[PDB]
Structure 1
Amino acid sequence: SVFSERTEESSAVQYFQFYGYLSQQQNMMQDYVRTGTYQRAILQNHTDFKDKIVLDVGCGSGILSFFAAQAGARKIYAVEASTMAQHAEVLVKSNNLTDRIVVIPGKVEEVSLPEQVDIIISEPMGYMLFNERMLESYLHAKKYLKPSGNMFPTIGDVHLAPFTDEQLYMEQFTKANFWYQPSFHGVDLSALRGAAVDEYFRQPVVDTFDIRILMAKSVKYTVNFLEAKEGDLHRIEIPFKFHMLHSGLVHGLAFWFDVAFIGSIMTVWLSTAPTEPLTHWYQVRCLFQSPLFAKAGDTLSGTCLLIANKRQSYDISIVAQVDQTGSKSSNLLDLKNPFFRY
């Protein structure tokens, strides 16, 4: 299928084992901002669901299908590839909704649905929006979407901004400097110090932070899910030009994302911005191995390039320069191995 061709079986097994756990479902359901905002988006746009046919891509426990049902959907096909499908089935029976929610086990790329659908709902966002490459499954699912069908969420905005955080930088550097030792119990480790630094700075940092560390207005890159095709996400090129508002060392870029549910009645935003209440997505920071000095009024320009890999993640390349000085930094991050710092 399209899923097995873009995915190592090793990555798929680990991925679906992980989403098989009820503890993991619970962790996500307890994020009140996530769950409450999805509910608000669907219920305040009840006319986008009333008497409609719905597809839920990756329904997990089924929670979004239940929200579609509360909003009056006639029929909801809830597709789920993990063993969580069986738990979803139990809840559909115990909430007396077997007439309206139909769980269909398997990958959305491999199953057959009996009907085209009016609206697709999902939670395909990973860290930094794109991690897990579940957005591809969500877009693939448009093959079941009626002409002029909607998607919830409808659009995703990635935000990037340069930051300064000396303590974060030093934490990671200090960990790599373990490999400087010329005599660790009598053994010289120092030839691996370079590789150790590479490895630590390759890890994106998932945590929150105070917005004061941001040194310029964010740049926005928008994916419109109504119009994008799965192959658009194999290679994502994000040019950026920051107008520096504060002088200081730039230790890297911070990422967060918003999605909008663009309904008939109203548009509801789910934000993971550091100005907004915290979600289980936190925010994400990619450190530069060598920080760049910049003055207020300078321009920091470059490119964030995401290349999809077969481990359901992305190789991240960030090249940035201070235009006024020609000072450049180049970085490769492996979004599959983030450092969870909270």
Structure 2
Amino acid sequence: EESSAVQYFQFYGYLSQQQNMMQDYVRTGTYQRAILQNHTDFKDKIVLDVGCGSGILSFFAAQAGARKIYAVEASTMAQHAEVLVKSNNLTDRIVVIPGKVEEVSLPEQVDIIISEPMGYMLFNERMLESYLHAKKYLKPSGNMFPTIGDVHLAPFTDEQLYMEQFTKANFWYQPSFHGVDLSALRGAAVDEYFRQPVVDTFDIRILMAKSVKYTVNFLEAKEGDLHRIEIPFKFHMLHSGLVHGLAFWFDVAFIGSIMTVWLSTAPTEPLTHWYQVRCLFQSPLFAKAGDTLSGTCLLIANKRQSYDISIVAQVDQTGSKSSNLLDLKNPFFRYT
């Protein structure tokens, strides 16, 4: 786990990463709107910013009137955050604390915790756990921004995406590649390709049923709740065809005193750098319009700051079933 955590924080030490995330207008703009339009939740309040990065969310909190903001960052980016606090003349209101939120010391309980802990499928990088851990500094009336997170799952049809895996793996199905028979590895290649969640976007037309929503309430959830996430699903198919897998996206809600602001990564919304995630079935399942596709998606926290994904699905009316295992730490970025 340590070898993955050090690489994770080294990755987040680069200003290019901060710039790429900040330039996502959905992300930065929705956070600023949620904080500013709920200024009553921040005016004169104590704020904790978990994983502040360059500190942008802490600056938004200061713009809303917070009396004191503790911005905690474990990567070297914390240094740069300090530079921004001095240059914006906010040292008396924003305190940058280098280190992990689980280890640093806060001198004071906070009125509200703000963070951007979302990864792919909302759970990748496991930072939500740190977010929930930060609740040890939250007052009994405390609030969380974001307040809740909805993960949406939906069956999809994409014959060409399914085809790509075998077209790629069939490189190995050659009896004389420079005189070498590679065919014995074909199966392994196939498996390796199917274990990769596919990060890109798609047309909403490929969705075959209304999505199923799994909700995490960050005010109520505990850290260990995220180690094992079981999402049952029962889709009522709106179209007839082959189902090649499940599509995942997420939304988060900032539930403030004045209003609730949503940040959505749905394929019906403008594209973000979270894109959408698709997990293929090893074998597709034929469903008639009106059938029910029932099963379970089990996300198990792994030692690489990600999740093993186990998906089991069946068409109830026919008994056809498919079972698939994926590793979210090695996704295939297909967007071009």
Give the TM-score of the pair, scaled to structure 1. Answer: 0.97
- How much does 1:172 deviate? 1.8
- How much does 1:301 deviate? 0.6
- How much does 1:167 deviate? 1.4
Question: Comparing 25-34 with 182-191, which one deviates more in the overlay?
Answer: 182-191
Q: Distance in 1 between matches of 2:330 and 2:72?
A: 27
**Match for residue 83 of structure 2?**
90
SS of 1:325's equivalent in the other structure is coil
Summarize deviations over 1:257-313 as a string: whole Å, max 9, x none.
000000000000000000001111000000112111111111001000000011100
Summarize deviations over 1:84-135 as a string: whole Å, max 9, x none.
0000000000001001000000000000100000000000010000000000
1:66 to 59, 82, 86: 59
- How much does 1:182 deviate? 1.8
Q: Distance in 2 between matches of 1:39 and 1:89?
A: 20
1:142 pairs with 2:110: no
Q: Distance in 1 between matches of 2:295 and 2:187?
A: 25
- How much does 1:250 deviate? 0.5
Q: Distance in 2 between matches of 1:322 and 1:183?
A: 41
- How much does 1:340 deviate? 0.6
Q: Distance in 2 between matches of 1:50 and 1:130?
A: 31
- How much does 1:161 deviate? 0.2
Q: Distance in 1 between matches of 2:166 and 2:217?
A: 38
Q: Distance in 1 between matches of 2:174 and 2:271?
A: 40
**Structure 1 residue runs of 4 or more that deviate by more than 2 Å after TM superposition:** none
Alignment size in residue pairs: 335
> Structure 1 regions of 5+ residues with no counterpart?
1-7
SS of 1:99's equivalent in the other structure is coil
1:40 pairs with 2:33: yes
Q: Distance in 2 between matches of 1:95 and 1:56?
A: 17
- How much does 1:184 deviate? 1.4
Task: Tell me the C-alpha RMSD between the 2 structures.
Answer: 0.6
Q: Distance in 2 between matches of 1:120 and 1:263?
A: 12
Q: Distance in 1 between matches of 2:172 and 2:297?
A: 29
Summarize deviations over 1:182-224 as a string: whole Å, max 9, x none.
2211211111111111100100011111100000000000000
- How much does 1:179 deviate? 1.6
> Structure 2 regions of 5+ residues with no counterpart?
none
Q: Distance in 1 between matches of 2:297 and 2:233?
A: 8
- How much does 1:168 deviate? 1.0
1:175 pairs with 2:168: yes
Summarize deviations over 1:2-22 as a string: whole Å, max 9, x none.
xxxxxx110011100000000
SS of 1:180's equivalent in the other structure is coil
Q: Distance in 2 between matches of 1:339 and 1:51?
A: 45
Q: Distance in 2 between matches of 1:188 and 1:294?
A: 39
Q: Distance in 1 between matches of 2:29 and 2:6?
A: 30
Summarize deviations over 1:227-267 as a string: whole Å, max 9, x none.
00000011000000000111111010000000000000000
**Match for residue 79 of structure 1?**
72
Summarize deviations over 1:144-182 as a string: whole Å, max 9, x none.
000010000000000000000111111122111112112
Q: Distance in 1 between matches of 2:174 and 2:315?
A: 34
**Match for residue 10 of structure 2?**
17
Summarize deviations over 1:22-80 as a string: whole Å, max 9, x none.
00000000000110000000000000000000000000000000000000000000000
